[PDB]
Amino acid sequence: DQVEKDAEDETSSDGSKSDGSAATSGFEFSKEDTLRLCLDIVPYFLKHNGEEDAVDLLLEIESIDKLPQFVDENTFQRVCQYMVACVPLLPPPEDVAFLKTAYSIYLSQNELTDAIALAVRLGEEDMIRSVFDATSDPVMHKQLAYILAAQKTSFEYEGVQDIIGNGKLSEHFLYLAKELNLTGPKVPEDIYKSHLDNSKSVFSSAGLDSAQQNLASSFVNGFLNLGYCNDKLIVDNDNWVYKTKGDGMTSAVASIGSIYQWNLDGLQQLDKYLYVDEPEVKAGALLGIGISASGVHDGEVEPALLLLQDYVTNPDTKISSAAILGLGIAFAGSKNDEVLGLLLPIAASTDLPIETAAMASLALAHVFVGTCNGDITTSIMDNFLERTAIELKTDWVRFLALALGILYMGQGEQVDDVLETISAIEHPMTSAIEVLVGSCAYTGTGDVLLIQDLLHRLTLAYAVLGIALIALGEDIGKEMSLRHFGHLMHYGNEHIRRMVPLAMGIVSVSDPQMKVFDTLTRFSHDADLEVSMNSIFAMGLCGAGTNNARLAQLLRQLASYYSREQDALFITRLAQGLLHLGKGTMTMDVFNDAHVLNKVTLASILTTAVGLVSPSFMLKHHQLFYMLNAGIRPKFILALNDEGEPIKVNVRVGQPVLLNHGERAELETDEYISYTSHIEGVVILKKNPDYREEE
Amino acid sequence: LKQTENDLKDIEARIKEKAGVKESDTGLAHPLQVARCTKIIKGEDAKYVINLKQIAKFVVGLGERVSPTDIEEGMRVGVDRSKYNIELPLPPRIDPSVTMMTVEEKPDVTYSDVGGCKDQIEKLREVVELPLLSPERFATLGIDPPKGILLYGPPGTGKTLCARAVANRTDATFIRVIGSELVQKYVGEGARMVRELFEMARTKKACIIFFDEIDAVGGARFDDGAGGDNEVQRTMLELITQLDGFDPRGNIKVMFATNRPNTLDPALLRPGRIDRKVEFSLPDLEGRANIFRIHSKSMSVERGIRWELISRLCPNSTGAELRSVCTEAGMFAIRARRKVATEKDFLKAVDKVISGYKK
Amino acid sequence: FVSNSEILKPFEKKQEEEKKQLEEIRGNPLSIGTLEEIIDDDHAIVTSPTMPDYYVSILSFVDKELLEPGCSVLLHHKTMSIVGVLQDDADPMVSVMKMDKSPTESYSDIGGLESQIQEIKESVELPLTHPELYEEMGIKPPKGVILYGAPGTGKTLLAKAVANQTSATFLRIVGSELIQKYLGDGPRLCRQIFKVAGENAPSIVFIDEIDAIGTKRYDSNSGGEREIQRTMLELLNQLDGFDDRGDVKVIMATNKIETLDPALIRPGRIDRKILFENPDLSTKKKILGIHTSKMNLSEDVNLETLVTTKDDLSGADIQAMCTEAGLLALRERRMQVTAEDFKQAKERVMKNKVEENLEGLYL
């Protein structure tokens, strides 16, 4: 009762990692007379080996300060096994807050099971790095580094990368220079790019004659040659490049960026078109560099992408349109004060003919995602309510409210700037944002007020984002949520409509369900023809790379649209074009082996949802067709020995019969034994102490 | 649209409920499943007054009148179970039985589970394939093919795909009628369904009328032969008066399927209607081998296996037991974690059928 | 309450002058019936359970596509007109229908049956969880499952354990109730089983304790029935007509399959045959650990002591031994069963409480 009364008013969640504080400052939790109670049962159960009943006593009183007293010396393995089936769920409800004090005393041990529980649920930054704290072996940290590349989230920006990635000698850091390039898609995508040179197929590309037909073939030149390096059409014959002007020239050089994409250098290759004469021929240069830099953030051996900060703000119309879209993709996961400083006046004035700020809002959430920035939410807050300079259009103002949705993640107490934007202008999607800001404000979710606030909003479309995290972490709120999910799918906006099958398609590889695909019948026809335009594209994006199979129920949804008019041909072919994405062979994986989802990849999915205007109605520029190359993840599985070195090891092959470093494979199970945190795909195996083997 | 259809009860339905109910219910009384009249005096000519309910049955005398369009008042007019006098021209033939009828013209089925059944095809070659191809040959022979053809064998095997294989060579129309679905709450559904089969067989020459599960109908049953209602009792009339008397033997043919011959009416088993009795045997070593090689095209296997040794270890089996060998072959591959079924998987699938059944 | 007052409440406030009054036009005197034939003339045939067959008209509520023949609809008392459509659950579909959500039994509580757990998973749970194994092989997983043994052990625990991991509702259908000894009720109750589980495929069909439809004999007497011949033969068409990816399975239990119709069997539709196996040493150990967790054991009671002398009783019978050991503790008025109680319990359970005696001399 002393904690529950103080649990409603506080700046954080339950639990603390400080074992030397009496909790007498501010809100009082443990009184002074409870000092003897903490040590009361300590000498008893230790000598009697009564830890079975001793743990159950700490679960009743919920005292986190008693945990380090029982763990002192002798066997540390037996006390961890009693924390598996007991500590996480004693009662019908579930309290995971007891892991806060477990980080300090188990710092040198932790557990194989507890390490997974720390990476999920609350998901604190210090909890994800606890896997490197318990083990001092730099070899064991290697296998944990490859899963960190697909992890992103907490540790992304220069706080770890670009600093420790040059190698370090210490206890729980141990990040070598190999883990810098090899774990992330930097060197492996370059070796993968060289693999497509001998794997190339027949190319239909040509130079044709007129520039009108070159624009139609420019999209094919970048789509067919994606991943393959071709110097014949670039250096030799420029007829399909120089003859195009305006939006055609930007889309022409944009195909060059996809040709050189996933290479060690994506800048100096395009410097030929960087400065020629007009801003029209200079526009596609900055766009292709960012497309070619997709997959790498801080560079391989050098931070080469930091030199593009001066290319952001340009008074030219064509360059500024291709600079924000191209550089916003390459700068993802890396925070910069100079890049943000030049993006503040662009998004403030929202000047279409000069600054081209239409895509500047989505770039702010795509770049700084996963980082900690308090100046980006404050500067926009003043420009959101006042709307200074020439800012007029309200849709671009609403785009800022959706742009800040990703910005307050991991900001802690800085989420108050988002609350001021909700009370300023009322938006349909901002009503549920004010509730979910407490996830990163309290450094976790699942509290008492957090659950009650969700039941008040439901009994709108954005509230289901935090419910799914609590439903998986709480069985009580999961049953009442499943009944609410059915009635929420009917709403004016399609946000609640399109997100339900998206989350189902992610887990469709494990537990497929056709009940969601039946409700989509109403999703196809709503009011106007613009509803059916994004309906086929949404059903085709989640079904990219799969022919029927578990999508057979979804096939009946797209069967209602075959041939209607000339404009309907472009609408029905949206799903057909996505089936061939990745030269016809692609496997989309938005998650990892940690039983969580990658929010950096999901951030690019929401960016393309608001974007991609050129395939939809009201086509503006032809440079938006290349946005699909941003969310494409490199498909490979690296073969490693017990030491994690790039050497050929004979094991079960993946999805391509020879497994080596740089070979394309995905979705392969691993039944063998590893060091810690056993994962599929890229894995470092070991051998029992009896013998020495790499399998 | 939602609020538009709500107030139609006070405006449009007032006329609809008056003409569709009050006129039909007038005097304690357009698909018609029911008709009733109570104390109607009309001057022999358009008298009607027929109660379709089994209680208080009526008749119509004093001459004969034919009015297929409108008998008396229109509205409620029915026949249902008992046919009375001049009420014949307007039978209540409406029923959602379209799900029961299956009509396939020139089936494409050749050999799937029927591989090796050519022995039974030769039994159906003379009395079925020959008249449906060159019926003029029987003019010089002096005789004609018998009316019906009886099928016999294991239950649920050989009565489905084997009948469509003969229709391929003759390019005939295969119509399968399930006998268990002929029995419904409507009395006379079995007899009325057989009526429409001969009507469609007269328009198009060389058609095959197949009756599936005749044991559920037969020539007589408890509710008809031993009962007062007429459904199967009137079904036998359509197989005698129509087929034998009016319908020529060359163009129109009839075939049944049954587990036992004694389950039918001994009146039908007599010569003149049901003559040819086709017994379904089991495929031999060559027949069982051609079935496995066809199923191996849709199932991933090893290119170096042999389908002849697979069918050799397995004894004579039905059409289903042979398909079980291929389906179970993939189950043993799951234990070994293989994408294709090797030769050892088929050997274990045969032993699973031999040991698991022992029939 | 707060969100719905500012959102859903004002939606009906503007329509309060219409939606409130226009819904009262139907009235309080309304009835229910079953559809027969639907046409575009706004007239149909409705039948109430009292069989008042009438030819009525159709009011405008929903389009004719949403009116399905054979489903319960909302009717009127006097005019018997069709004012709308209702849910089909009012149809007397199956005589005994029970949907059990979240079954209690699982694979860990059934003992040493893991040899049969991986085998039953392939025919039921595997195509539900991972159909791609059968999809890459281009084959259809077996829909049916044949059970043997005794009830409570192999005919019960094995049925409720597979429904737990599949996260499907347990649907029990009595086998003896499938035959009403009436013409037309046999195929009717069989088609309604796949209808309730065939919409979203939420559950799995389970059938247990068949002493009746399994044996038709030769005649309606001597334990068999004539309606069994038509019911089993027509049920085969429902097995082949039903097609899915394995979200719905059919598990039937019978003592002997020799009396079954080889047509309804149709090998390749049912690839799963579960034979009763004798419990091993690990079976009793898993049953004891559940009850001995809440039951305090003395210092002379160990795991290898209780399994030393055993007849290989099933997982259920071992539970009866733990209850008898606790019954002797109530005689001495204590909550901790000592080792002296198990010695007298094993003699009473396997002899007095279960009469076997193991008749010898080659028998």
Side-chain angles (χ1 to χ4, degrees):
Chain A
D1 290 344
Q2 185 64 59
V3 176
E4 292 177 350
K5 292 176 179 177
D6 290 344
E8 294 177 350
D9 186 5
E10 61 184 343
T11 59
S12 63
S13 64
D14 186 6
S16 178
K17 292 189 295 184
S18 178
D19 290 344
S21 178
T24 59
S25 63
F27 296 96
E28 183 178 2
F29 296 96
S30 178
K31 294 176 179 177
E32 294 178 350
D33 290 344
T34 59
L35 296 175
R36 296 182 183 175
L37 178 63
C38 296
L39 296 175
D40 179 66
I41 60 172
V42 175
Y44 176 77
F45 296 97
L46 293 175
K47 183 180 172 63
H48 183 62
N49 290 283
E51 295 85 358
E52 294 178 350
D53 290 344
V55 173
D56 290 344
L57 296 176
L58 276 67
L59 297 174
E60 294 299 323
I61 62 173
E62 294 178 351
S63 178
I64 61 172
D65 290 344
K66 293 167 62 181
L67 178 62
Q69 294 300 321
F70 295 97
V71 176
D72 182 67
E73 63 184 343
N74 290 337
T75 300
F76 297 96
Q77 295 300 321
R78 295 177 64 185
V79 297
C80 295
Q81 294 178 336
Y82 296 140
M83 293 178 71
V84 176
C86 296
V87 175
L89 182 71
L90 178 63
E94 182 176 1
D95 186 5
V96 296
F98 295 159
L99 296 175
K100 301 301 287 185
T101 58
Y103 176 78
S104 178
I105 189 65
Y106 295 96
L107 179 65
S108 64
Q109 294 300 321
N110 288 335
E111 183 65 13
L112 296 175
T113 300
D114 290 344
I116 296 171
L118 294 175
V120 299
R121 293 179 178 85
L122 298 175
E124 184 179 2
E125 295 178 350
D126 291 344
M127 293 177 182
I128 295 171
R129 66 181 181 89
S130 63
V131 295
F132 297 97
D133 292 344
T135 59
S136 64
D137 186 6
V139 176
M140 294 178 182
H141 296 166
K142 293 177 179 177
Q143 185 175 355
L144 296 174
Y146 294 95
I147 191 65
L148 178 63
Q151 185 64 59
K152 294 181 180 297
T153 62
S154 295
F155 297 98
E156 183 66 14
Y157 62 90
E158 187 179 2
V160 175
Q161 298 300 321
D162 192 10
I163 302 300
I164 308 301
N166 290 283
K168 180 62 174 172
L169 296 175
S170 63
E171 294 178 350
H172 60 79
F173 294 158
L174 294 175
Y175 295 95
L176 296 175
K178 293 177 179 177
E179 295 178 352
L180 174 64
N181 291 337
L182 295 175
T183 59
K186 295 176 180 177
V187 173
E189 67 183 346
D190 181 67
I191 296 170
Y192 175 78
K193 183 180 172 63
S194 296
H195 182 62
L196 273 64
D197 290 344
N198 291 336
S199 296
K200 63 182 178 181
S201 63
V202 176
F203 296 99
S204 63
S205 296
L208 296 175
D209 187 6
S210 63
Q212 294 177 336
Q213 294 300 321
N214 290 336
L215 177 62
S217 64
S218 178
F219 177 80
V220 177
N221 291 337
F223 177 80
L224 178 63
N225 290 283
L226 177 62
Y228 176 77
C229 182
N230 189 340
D231 59 352
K232 183 178 179 180
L233 275 67
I234 295 170
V235 177
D236 290 344
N237 290 283
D238 59 352
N239 290 337
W240 60 275
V241 176
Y242 176 77
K243 293 177 179 177
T244 59
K245 294 177 179 177
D247 290 344
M249 179 66 181
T250 300
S251 178
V253 180
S255 296
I256 295 170
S258 63
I259 294 170
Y260 296 140
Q261 187 173 355
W262 295 355
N263 192 30
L264 295 175
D265 186 5
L267 188 146
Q268 294 178 336
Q269 295 300 321
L270 275 67
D271 289 345
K272 183 173 178 290
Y273 295 93
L274 180 63
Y275 295 97
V276 178
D277 187 6
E278 294 178 350
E280 294 178 350
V281 298
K282 296 176 180 177
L286 296 175
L287 178 63
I289 294 170
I291 295 170
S292 64
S294 178
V296 63
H297 298 166
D298 59 352
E300 295 84 357
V301 297
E302 183 178 2
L305 295 176
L306 295 176
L307 296 175
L308 296 175
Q309 63 180 19
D310 290 344
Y311 295 93
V312 176
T313 298
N314 189 335
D316 291 343
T317 298
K318 302 299 183 181
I319 296 170
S320 63
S321 178
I324 295 171
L325 177 63
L327 276 66
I329 296 170
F331 295 162
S334 296
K335 63 181 180 181
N336 189 340
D337 290 344
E338 182 67 15
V339 174
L340 177 63
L342 295 175
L343 293 174
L344 295 176
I346 294 171
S349 64
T350 62
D351 189 5
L352 177 62
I354 295 171
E355 293 177 350
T356 62
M359 297 297 179
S361 63
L362 296 175
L364 295 174
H366 188 278
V367 173
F368 296 96
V369 59
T371 61
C372 183
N373 190 340
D375 290 344
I376 185 169
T377 59
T378 300
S379 296
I380 296 171
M381 176 179 71
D382 290 344
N383 291 336
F384 177 81
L385 188 147
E386 294 178 350
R387 292 192 298 274
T388 59
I390 61 172
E391 183 178 2
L392 177 63
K393 180 62 173 172
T394 59
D395 289 345
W396 294 356
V397 176
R398 183 180 65 256
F399 295 160
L400 296 175
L402 296 176
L404 272 65
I406 298 171
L407 295 177
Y408 65 86
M409 176 179 71
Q411 295 301 322
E413 71 281 4
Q414 294 300 321
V415 297
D416 290 344
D417 290 344
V418 177
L419 296 175
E420 296 301 321
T421 59
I422 295 170
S423 63
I425 297 170
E426 183 178 2
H427 299 289
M429 293 178 71
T430 58
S431 63
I433 294 173
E434 62 184 343
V435 176
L436 275 67
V437 295
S439 64
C440 296
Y442 295 93
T443 62
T445 188
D447 290 344
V448 176
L449 295 175
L450 295 175
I451 295 171
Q452 294 178 336
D453 290 344
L454 294 174
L455 296 175
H456 297 166
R457 299 290 182 268
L458 274 65
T459 59
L460 178 63
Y462 177 77
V464 296
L465 178 63
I467 295 170
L469 296 175
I470 295 171
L472 295 175
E474 182 67 15
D475 290 344
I476 294 171
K478 183 178 179 180
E479 183 178 2
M480 294 183 286
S481 64
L482 295 175
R483 294 182 182 175
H484 297 166
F485 294 159
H487 300 290
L488 294 175
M489 293 178 71
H490 300 290
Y491 178 75
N493 190 340
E494 294 178 350
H495 182 62
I496 191 65
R497 295 182 183 175
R498 62 176 65 88
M499 293 300 294
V500 177
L502 177 63
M504 182 65 73
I506 296 170
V507 297
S508 63
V509 297
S510 296
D511 186 5
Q513 186 173 356
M514 293 178 181
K515 183 178 179 180
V516 175
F517 296 159
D518 181 67
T519 304
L520 296 175
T521 299
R522 181 177 179 272
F523 177 79
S524 63
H525 295 83
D526 187 6
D528 290 344
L529 296 175
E530 294 178 350
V531 174
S532 296
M533 295 178 71
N534 290 336
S535 296
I536 295 171
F537 177 80
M539 294 177 182
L541 177 63
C542 296
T546 299
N547 189 340
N548 290 336
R550 295 181 183 175
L551 296 174
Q553 185 64 59
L554 179 63
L555 178 63
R556 294 182 182 175
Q557 294 300 322
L558 296 175
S560 63
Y561 295 93
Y562 176 77
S563 178
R564 300 289 182 268
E565 62 184 343
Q566 294 178 336
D567 290 344
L569 296 175
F570 296 95
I571 297 170
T572 59
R573 291 173 295 180
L574 295 175
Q576 294 178 336
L578 296 174
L579 295 175
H580 300 290
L581 178 63
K583 291 190 295 184
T585 299
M586 181 172 175
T587 59
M588 182 177 284
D589 185 5
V590 297
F591 59 89
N592 61 345
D593 291 343
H595 300 290
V596 296
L597 296 175
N598 190 29
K599 294 176 179 177
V600 176
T601 300
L602 295 175
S604 296
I605 295 170
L606 296 175
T607 300
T608 59
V610 177
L612 295 174
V613 178
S614 62
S616 178
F617 59 89
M618 295 300 294
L619 188 147
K620 294 177 179 177
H621 301 290
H622 300 290
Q623 64 180 20
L624 297 176
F625 296 97
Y626 295 92
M627 293 178 70
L628 296 175
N629 290 336
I632 294 171
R633 295 177 63 185
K635 181 180 177 180
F636 59 90
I637 292 173
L638 298 175
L640 297 175
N641 61 344
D642 59 352
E643 294 178 350
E645 295 301 321
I647 187 169
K648 294 177 179 177
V649 177
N650 190 30
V651 293
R652 184 176 179 84
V653 297
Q655 185 64 59
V657 297
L658 296 175
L659 178 62
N660 59 33
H661 187 279
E663 183 67 15
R664 180 177 65 84
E666 184 66 14
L667 296 175
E668 182 67 15
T669 59
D670 186 5
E671 294 178 350
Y672 295 93
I673 296 170
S674 63
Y675 295 93
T676 186
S677 296
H678 182 62
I679 60 172
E680 295 177 351
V682 176
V683 63
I684 295 171
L685 297 176
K686 63 179 293 180
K687 180 61 175 172
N688 290 336
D690 290 344
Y691 296 139
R692 296 176 63 185
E693 293 178 351
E694 294 178 350
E695 183 178 2
Chain B
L1 296 175
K2 294 177 179 177
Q3 294 178 336
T4 300
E5 294 177 350
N6 290 336
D7 60 9
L8 296 177
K9 183 173 178 290
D10 183 67
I11 297 170
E12 293 178 350
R14 297 295 181 190
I15 296 170
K16 294 176 179 177
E17 293 177 350
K18 183 178 179 180
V21 175
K22 294 177 179 177
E23 293 178 350
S24 64
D25 290 344
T26 299
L28 296 175
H30 297 166
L32 297 173
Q33 294 300 321
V34 64
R36 183 181 64 196
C37 293
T38 299
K39 291 190 295 184
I40 303 301
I41 296 170
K42 301 297 182 181
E44 183 178 2
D45 186 5
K47 183 178 179 180
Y48 178 72
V49 182
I50 301 300
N51 191 30
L52 274 64
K53 184 178 179 180
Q54 294 178 336
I55 302 301
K57 294 176 179 177
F58 296 96
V59 296
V60 175
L62 296 175
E64 182 178 2
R65 300 289 182 268
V66 176
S67 179
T69 300
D70 185 4
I71 294 172
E72 180 182 1
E73 295 301 321
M75 297 303 295
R76 301 291 183 85
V77 175
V79 176
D80 187 5
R81 294 178 178 84
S82 296
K83 295 176 178 178
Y84 295 97
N85 195 30
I86 61 172
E87 296 301 321
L88 297 175
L90 182 61
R93 293 182 181 174
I94 304 301
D95 187 6
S97 295
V98 296
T99 59
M100 174 180 70
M101 177 178 71
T102 299
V103 176
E104 182 67 15
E105 183 178 2
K106 294 176 180 177
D108 59 352
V109 176
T110 60
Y111 295 93
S112 178
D113 290 344
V114 296
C117 294
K118 294 177 179 177
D119 290 344
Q120 293 82 359
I121 295 171
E122 295 301 321
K123 301 301 287 185
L124 295 174
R125 181 177 181 171
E126 294 177 350
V127 296
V128 176
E129 182 178 1
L130 178 61
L132 294 175
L133 177 63
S134 178
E136 294 178 350
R137 184 182 296 275
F138 296 96
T140 59
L141 295 174
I143 62 171
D144 288 341
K147 271 70 179 182
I149 295 98
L150 179 63
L151 275 65
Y152 176 78
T157 300
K159 63 182 179 181
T160 59
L161 295 175
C162 183
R164 294 182 182 175
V166 177
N168 190 340
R169 292 177 63 85
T170 59
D171 289 343
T173 299
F174 177 80
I175 295 171
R176 181 177 181 171
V177 176
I178 295 170
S180 64
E181 294 301 321
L182 294 174
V183 177
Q184 294 300 321
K185 62 182 178 181
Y186 176 78
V187 176
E189 182 66 15
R192 182 178 64 84
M193 179 66 181
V194 176
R195 292 178 63 85
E196 294 178 350
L197 295 175
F198 295 99
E199 293 177 350
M200 294 183 286
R202 293 182 182 175
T203 299
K204 294 177 179 177
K205 294 177 179 177
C207 294
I208 295 171
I209 296 171
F210 177 80
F211 295 95
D212 187 6
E213 296 176 351
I214 193 65
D215 290 344
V217 176
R221 60 176 183 183
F222 177 80
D223 290 344
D224 290 343
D229 290 344
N230 291 282
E231 183 177 2
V232 177
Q233 186 172 353
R234 292 177 296 181
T235 301
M236 178 178 71
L237 294 174
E238 297 301 320
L239 296 175
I240 295 171
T241 300
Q242 294 300 321
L243 176 64
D244 185 4
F246 295 98
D247 291 343
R249 291 190 294 272
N251 290 337
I252 295 170
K253 292 182 68 66
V254 174
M255 293 176 71
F256 297 96
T258 187
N259 292 338
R260 181 177 181 171
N262 290 336
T263 59
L264 295 175
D265 186 6
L268 296 175
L269 296 175
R270 293 175 297 181
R273 291 192 297 273
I274 295 171
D275 290 344
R276 296 286 294 174
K277 294 177 179 177
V278 176
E279 182 178 2
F280 178 80
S281 63
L282 297 176
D284 59 352
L285 175 62
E286 183 178 2
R288 293 191 298 273
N290 290 336
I291 295 170
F292 295 161
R293 62 180 295 176
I294 295 170
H295 297 166
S296 64
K297 294 177 179 177
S298 296
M299 175 177 71
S300 296
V301 296
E302 183 178 2
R303 66 184 182 276
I305 62 172
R306 181 177 181 171
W307 60 92
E308 294 178 351
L309 296 175
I310 296 170
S311 63
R312 181 176 181 170
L313 178 63
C314 182
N316 290 336
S317 296
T318 59
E321 294 178 350
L322 296 176
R323 185 182 295 275
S324 178
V325 177
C326 296
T327 59
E328 293 177 350
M331 293 178 70
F332 296 97
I334 296 170
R335 294 182 182 175
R337 292 177 63 85
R338 294 183 181 276
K339 302 299 183 181
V340 297
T342 59
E343 183 67 15
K344 294 177 179 177
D345 290 343
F346 296 97
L347 296 175
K348 294 177 179 177
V350 175
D351 290 344
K352 183 173 178 290
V353 176
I354 294 171
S355 63
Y357 294 92
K358 294 177 179 177
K359 294 177 179 177
Chain C
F1 177 80
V2 176
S3 178
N4 291 337
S5 63
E6 295 301 321
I7 295 171
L8 295 175
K9 183 178 179 180
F11 294 162
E12 294 177 350
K13 183 178 179 180
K14 294 176 179 177
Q15 294 178 336
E16 183 178 2
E17 294 177 350
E18 296 301 321
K19 183 178 179 180
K20 183 178 179 180
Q21 294 178 336
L22 272 64
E23 291 177 350
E24 294 178 350
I25 298 170
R26 292 192 297 273
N28 303 275
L30 271 63
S31 63
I32 187 169
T34 300
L35 296 176
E36 295 301 321
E37 182 67 15
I38 303 301
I39 60 173
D40 59 352
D41 290 344
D42 290 344
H43 294 82
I45 301 300
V46 295
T47 299
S48 296
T50 59
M51 295 299 294
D53 187 5
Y54 295 138
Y55 175 77
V56 297
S57 63
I58 296 171
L59 276 66
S60 295
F61 178 78
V62 293
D63 290 344
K64 62 180 180 296
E65 294 178 350
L66 295 175
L67 295 175
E68 183 178 2
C71 296
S72 296
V73 296
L74 180 62
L75 295 178
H76 187 276
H77 183 197
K78 302 299 183 181
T79 59
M80 294 298 294
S81 63
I82 297 170
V83 68
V85 63
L86 295 175
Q87 188 173 356
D88 59 352
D89 289 344
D91 187 6
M93 294 174 70
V94 179
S95 63
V96 176
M97 176 178 71
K98 294 176 180 177
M99 293 178 71
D100 186 5
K101 294 177 179 178
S102 296
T104 59
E105 296 302 321
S106 63
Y107 295 141
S108 63
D109 290 344
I110 61 173
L113 296 175
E114 294 178 350
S115 178
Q116 294 178 336
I117 292 173
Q118 294 178 336
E119 294 178 351
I120 187 171
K121 183 178 179 180
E122 294 178 351
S123 64
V124 176
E125 181 179 0
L126 178 62
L128 188 147
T129 59
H130 300 290
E132 71 279 4
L133 275 67
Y134 295 93
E135 293 177 351
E136 293 177 350
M137 294 177 182
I139 60 172
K140 294 177 179 177
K143 302 299 182 181
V145 173
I146 296 170
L147 295 175
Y148 294 93
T153 60
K155 293 166 63 181
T156 299
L157 297 175
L158 295 175
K160 294 177 179 177
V162 63
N164 190 341
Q165 295 296 100
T166 58
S167 296
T169 300
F170 177 81
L171 178 63
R172 185 177 180 84
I173 295 98
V174 176
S176 64
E177 295 302 321
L178 295 174
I179 301 300
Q180 294 300 321
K181 294 176 180 178
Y182 177 76
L183 178 62
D185 288 345
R188 181 177 181 171
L189 274 66
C190 295
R191 292 192 297 273
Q192 296 301 321
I193 294 170
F194 296 96
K195 183 178 179 180
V196 62
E199 296 301 321
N200 290 283
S203 63
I204 294 171
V205 176
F206 297 95
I207 296 171
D208 187 5
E209 296 300 321
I210 294 171
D211 290 344
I213 187 170
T215 301
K216 62 182 179 181
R217 297 294 181 191
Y218 295 93
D219 188 5
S220 63
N221 58 33
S222 296
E225 294 301 321
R226 293 182 182 175
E227 295 84 357
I228 296 172
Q229 295 178 336
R230 294 178 179 84
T231 300
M232 294 178 71
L233 179 62
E234 182 65 15
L235 179 63
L236 177 63
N237 290 336
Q238 294 300 320
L239 296 175
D240 291 344
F242 177 80
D243 186 5
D244 59 351
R245 295 185 181 278
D247 290 344
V248 175
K249 301 299 183 181
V250 176
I251 295 172
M252 294 183 286
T254 187
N255 290 283
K256 184 185 292 179
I257 61 171
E258 294 178 350
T259 59
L260 294 175
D261 186 6
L264 178 62
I265 295 171
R266 186 175 178 84
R269 297 295 181 190
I270 298 170
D271 290 344
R272 181 57 177 162
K273 183 178 179 180
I274 296 170
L275 295 175
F276 178 80
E277 294 177 350
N278 296 131
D280 59 352
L281 177 63
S282 64
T283 300
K284 183 178 179 180
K285 294 177 179 177
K286 294 177 179 177
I287 303 301
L288 295 174
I290 295 170
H291 294 82
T292 57
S293 63
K294 294 177 179 177
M295 176 178 71
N296 290 336
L297 296 175
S298 63
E299 294 178 350
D300 290 344
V301 176
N302 290 283
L303 178 63
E304 294 178 350
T305 300
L306 296 175
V307 298
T308 299
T309 299
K310 62 189 183 71
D311 290 344
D312 290 344
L313 276 65
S314 63
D317 289 344
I318 301 301
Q319 184 173 355
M321 183 177 284
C322 296
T323 60
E324 183 67 15
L327 178 63
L328 296 175
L330 296 175
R331 180 182 294 176
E332 296 301 321
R333 292 177 63 85
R334 68 172 64 197
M335 293 177 70
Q336 185 173 355
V337 177
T338 59
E340 294 178 350
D341 290 344
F342 296 100
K343 294 177 179 177
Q344 294 178 336
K346 62 182 178 181
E347 294 178 350
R348 291 177 64 85
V349 173
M350 293 184 286
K351 294 177 179 177
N352 290 336
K353 303 299 182 181
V354 174
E355 57 183 343
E356 295 302 321
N357 192 30
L358 193 145
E359 293 177 350
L361 296 175
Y362 296 91
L363 177 61

